[PDB]
Amino acid sequence: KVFGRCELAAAMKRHGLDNYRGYSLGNWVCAAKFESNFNTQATNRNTDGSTDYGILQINSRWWCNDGRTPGSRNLCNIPCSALLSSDITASVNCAKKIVSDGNGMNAWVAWRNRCKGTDVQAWIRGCRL
Ligand SMILES: [Cl-]
Ligand SMILES: [Cl-]
Ligand SMILES: [Cl-]
Ligand SMILES: [Cl-]
Ligand SMILES: [Cl-]
Ligand SMILES: [Cl-]
Ligand SMILES: [Cl-]
Ligand code: NA
**Domain boundaries defined on the chain:** 1-129
- At 97 the three-state DSSP class reads helix
Name beta bridge partners: 121: none
The helix (run of H) or strand (run of E) holding residue 44 is strand 43-45
Instruction: Write out the residues surrounding ion ligand 2, Cβ under 5 A.
Output: 24, 26, 120-121
DSSP string, 48-101: TS-EEETTTTEETTTT-B-S-STT---TT-SBGGGGG-SS-HHHHHHHHHHHTS
Instruction: Give the residue from 83, 81, 87, 47 showing the smallest Cα distance to 67.
Output: 81
Helix (H) or strand (E) holding 113: helix 109-114
Do residues 57 and 28 lie in contact, with contact meaning Cβ atoms separated by under 8 Å? no
- 1-129 — its CATH code? 1.10.530.10
Q: Entry resolution in angstroms?
A: 1.9
Distance between CA atoms of 7 and 122, rounded to whole angstroms?
15
Which ligand is closest to the CA of 13, given by its number? 5
101 assigned ligand-binding residue? yes
Inter-axis angle of helices 5-14 and 25-36, to 10 degrees?
120
Q: Which residues are catalytic?
A: 35, 52
For residue 74, give the ligand nearest its CA. 8
43-45, strands of its sheet edge to edge: 43-45, 51-53, 58-59
| Residue 79 β-bridge partners | 65
* Residues with Cβ–ion distance below 5 A, ligand 3: 67, 69, 72
Which one-letter DSSP state was computed for residue 103?
A: S
For residue 68, the tally of other CB atoms under 10 A from its CB is 11
Long-range pairs of 98-103 with CB within 8 A, sequence gap ≥ 24: 98/58, 98/63, 99/20, 99/21, 99/23, 100/21
> Does residue 73 contact residue 62 with C-beta atoms inside 8 Å?
yes
Q: How far apart are CA 105 and CA 127, in angstroms?
A: 23
Centre of ligand 7 to C-alpha 31, Å, is 19
Q: Where are the beta strands (DSSP E) in 7-56?
A: 43-45, 51-53
